[PDB]
Amino acid sequence: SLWRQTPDLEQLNASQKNSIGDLLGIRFEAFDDESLTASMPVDSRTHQPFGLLHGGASVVLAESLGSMASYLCVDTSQYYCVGLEVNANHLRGLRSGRVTAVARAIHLGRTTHVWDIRLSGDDGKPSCIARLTMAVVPL
Amino acid sequence: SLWRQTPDLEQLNASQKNSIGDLLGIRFEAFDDESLTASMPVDSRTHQPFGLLHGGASVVLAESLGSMASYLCVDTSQYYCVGLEVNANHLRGLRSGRVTAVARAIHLGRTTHVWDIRLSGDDGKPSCIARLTMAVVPL
Q1: Residue A99 in contact with residue A70, Cβ under 8 Å?
Q2: Which domain covers residue B44, as residue numbers?
Q3: Which domain of life is it from (chains A, B)?
Q4: Mutation choice for B interface testing from A80, A90, A128 by most B CBs within 10 A
Q5: How far is CA B78 from CA A90, B6, B71, B74, B75, in A?
Q6: Which of A131, B63, B102, B139 is the most exposed place for a label (fewest CB within 10 A)?
Q7: How many structural domains compose chain A?
């Protein structure tokens, strides 16, 4: 419904080869008519030096997810999307397991998109909330 | 001047072992009485799928830098610091070389710190600006 290109999880995952998403183990996991979901491990790849998930790593997941969501909503023969502004509140710390992010659209304008991204650890409690603004740019 | 603990670059770098900073090649490079500086490579470790520096990777650098700056400003026998809020504007894209971030203090309160972090690529042009709010928490 939201999407122009039907999300293809194998393709989304494969496209991360030789980029930070592959390095951190980001996995696109699910989608429906209103949302796209990806998760990331909480381990030495994504920890800060004190053994907690790095707040920046939460932002990598959020921006990977939202950037991919934008790509799936534009005419990619004419436009590309790049991150313009990002913000996040770090709500709860995580030490292990996986962190899961779900992106939903706030506004898909002609020149900007705004995404709402909610993250939680395996206990299901909110761990981070992010908002991402993407610029839509002529190819 | 700003610092409680004198910054020790070897220690800052060594402390990143088995965390995302080591994985992405973040290197603490310089400091003075008012600032702390670190850089990060722009390559396959930090690219997004289109060959540009991942906006989230800029945020990892900014939050690594600011979190370390906070650690150097508090009494670590009584307090620790964790990221509370982060935001960034993505100004210019980068494809290669290194990205360098400089952190300066905006406010060091008793319960929160606010850091200004400016990033630029090797051409010296501003590429990202971030602002980070850390919570100061009793050990």
Answers
A1: no
A2: 1-139
A3: Bacteria
A4: A90
A5: 22, 18, 11, 8, 6
A6: B139
A7: 1
